[PDB]
Amino acid sequence: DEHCERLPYDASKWEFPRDRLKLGKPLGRGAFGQVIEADAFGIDKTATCRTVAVKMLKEGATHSEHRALMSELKILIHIGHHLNVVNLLGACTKPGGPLMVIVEFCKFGNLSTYLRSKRNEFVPYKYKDFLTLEHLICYSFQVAKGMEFLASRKCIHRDLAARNILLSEKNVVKICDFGLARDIYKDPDYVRKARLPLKWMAPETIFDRVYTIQSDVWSFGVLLWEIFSLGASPYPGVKIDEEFCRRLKEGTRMRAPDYTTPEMYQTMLDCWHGEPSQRPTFSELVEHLGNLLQANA
Numbered sequence: 001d002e003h004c005e006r007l008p009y010d011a012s013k014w015e016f017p018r019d020r021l022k023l024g025k026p027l028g029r030g031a032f033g034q035v036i037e038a039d040a041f042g043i044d045k046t047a048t049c050r051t052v053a054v055k056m057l058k059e060g061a062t063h064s065e066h067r068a069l070m071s072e073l074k075i076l077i078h079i080g081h082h083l084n085v086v087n088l089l090g091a092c093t094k095p096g097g098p099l100m101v102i103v104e105f106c107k108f109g110n111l112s113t114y115l116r117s118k119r120n121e122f123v124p125y126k127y128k129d130f131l132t133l134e135h136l137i138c139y140s141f142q143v144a145k146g147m148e149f150l151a152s153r154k155c156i157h158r159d160l161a162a163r164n165i166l167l168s169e170k171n172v173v174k175i176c177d178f179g180l181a182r183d184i185y186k187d188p189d190y191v192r193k194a195r196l197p198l199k200w201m202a203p204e205t206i207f208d209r210v211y212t213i214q215s216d217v218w219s220f221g222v223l224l225w226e227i228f229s230l231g232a233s234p235y236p237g238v239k240i241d242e243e244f245c246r247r248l249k250e251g252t253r254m255r256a257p258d259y260t261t262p263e264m265y266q267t268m269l270d271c272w273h274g275e276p277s278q279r280p281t282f283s284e285l286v287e288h289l290g291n292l293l294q295a296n297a
């Protein structure tokens with residue numbers, strides 16, 4: 001996924017005509033990119049109008065950002081379809097218009113915002129639309145599934161967080177990446193030096209700047225904390241600086257979130273192990289959360 005200029009674009013399969021795509025109101029805006037809500041006619045089903053999310057650039061973007069987006073398109077094609085990864089539906093790449101990457105619409109938006117909104121409507125055990133402990137383990141399991149899939153397609157995420165998990169209908173959650181559609185300069189999550197999501201980054205990524213599937217496992221552990229604090233921000237009160245990293249470098253971890261179970265907090269700790277090889281794989285995380293899901297019901 002770092003050598004994606006060699007990956008094909010099959011236009012006869014993926015090209016969607018711009019005149020069958022009707023753009024609506026923006027869902028997220030960054031500095032160079034945006035995600036737009038749209039209506040797409042017959043994109044996945046014959047003569048069927050479907051709501052979709054369109055990822056594209058905006059005023060300020062250059063040829064450089066255009067290449068990056070074309071890369072994200074090619075990677076999504078390569079990766080292929082999976083329930084818990086935001087599915088590609090088509091693209092407008094023809095000259096005379098902007099590069100548009102057309103993906104699934106996820107009604108309920110990002111998982112961080114959504115979980116926050118459900119603090120009032122939560123009960124561990126079951127209330128028509130109330131979240132439960134089961135819902136939370138289920139989300140965790142789904143994301144682990146999606147990440148196992150991505151890992152097996154020889155690529156890594158690099159920005160795994162609740163804000164990059166979307167919630168569709170019927171409790172399906174999907175891994176995505178807003179990328180340039182997120183305003184990293186005005187988002188508190190991205191601390192200044194490049195703007196990096198330091199609270200989700202593993203020590204070797206902070207100090208040595210090494211990105212691996214195992215550093216995503218670390219980030220998954222932080223996502224678990226977000227899920228089981230119902231969308232709270234990680235390391236509350238604590239300010240992210242040079243002396244915040246040294247504490248992590250010698251084993252200071254977050255306390256248990258308000259809604260966790262003992263096993264779930266232990267799973268966060270496993271993910272936050274110092275040695276990258278000592279962290280569980282996503283294959284192991286899928287089996288383990290599957291067990292915990294069964295133990296809950």
Ligand SMILES: Cc1oc(-c2ccccc2)nc1COc1cccc(CO)c1
Pocket residue numbers: 035053055072073075076085086101103150156157175176177178
């Ligand atoms: C094109 C696109 O649009 C959105 C998106 C669509 C709508 C809203 C927010 C984001 N997510 C993606 C990609 O999601 C990914 C999944 C796995 C791996 C990678 C690459 O590491 C990317």
